[PDB]
From Swiss-Prot, chain B:
Protein name: Inner capsid protein VP1
Superkingdom as given in the UniProt entry: Viruses
Full-length numbering of the shown residues: 940 to 988 of 1333
Location in or out of the cell: Virion
Role summary: Inner capsid protein that self-assembles to form an icosahedral capsid with a T=2 symmetry, which consists of 120 copies of VP2, with channels at each of its five-fold vertices. This capsid constitutes the innermost concentric layer of the viral mature particle.
Subunit annotation: Homodecamer; each decamer is made up of two conformers of VP2, called VP2A and VP2B. 12 homodecamers assemble to form an icosahedral capsid.
Amino acid sequence: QQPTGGYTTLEQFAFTIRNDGTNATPTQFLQLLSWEATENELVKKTIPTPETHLPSARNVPGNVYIEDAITQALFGISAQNVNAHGYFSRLSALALPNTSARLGLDGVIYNSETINIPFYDPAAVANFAATYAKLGNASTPRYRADMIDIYAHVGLELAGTDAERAAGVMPVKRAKFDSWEGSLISLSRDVVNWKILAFLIDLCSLEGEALRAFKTRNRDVFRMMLFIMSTAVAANVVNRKVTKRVDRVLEYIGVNSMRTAGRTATITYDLSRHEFAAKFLQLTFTRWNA
Amino acid sequence: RYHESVLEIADIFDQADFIQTSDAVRQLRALMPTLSTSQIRHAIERIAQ
């Protein structure tokens, strides 16, 4: 039960990976990417403000594993059956003015006195679940996130050089890099492992001056969050040969292709998974921008 | 004064997308008893068999 000052930036919540084997904080891994531009453009539009009304808080019996689940779904490897209310209806509760369900540090949801498990501030998580509960809507017909517009954003957000391309437009860039066999997936799982909440609870709380200081601090943790995430969608991915070294080449880094089969070089969204990621991005982005 | 050597071709070209196999073959063909065209028709005819 510890306060803040910034939830991340606090030991336990570090974000690392694997560079064919080492670690390196993501900023360090994304600086190893290259973009051939290619016709088109990705004129960002406007994320449709969230569907305000969130799922009804249903007690339900159990310990909703949320950090783990939200991510298993976003960049997992196949989350079988995502969006099921069950986990979110419950997560909704946390978004009330007074409850017992404490959000366990490790990434869970409890009752009364969780006991032992040092949960989060009750306030921070309050503002958190406020929005990320709506996330348990993406399933329903009238709330779908409407994904191809949203991926426009993911892009000038991920690639697109600062400022220059941070001006609404840019060419789809086909991204490639020196990989290491089964690179994309191995990398994704280092991320499935990651502690997300720490990132959001902090993202949905931090005042305003501190919020910007924070945006810069995780500029990269965040870009990395969705690089591995966007490749799930990006069409073809193949390996470009070079000179003994191999270079993973990614179809188009920004143009979600709404593909649902199961590649090998990467993750793969079932259809309903897009329904979920599309929605998750709508929220993080509406939020990232303020 | 010789050190008659194999010089595995690859140690000459930088764009090794053509280069293949190796010095290991000279080792082998050095053993094959020089064959005639009629001779090969046979070696091949019997492998395929």
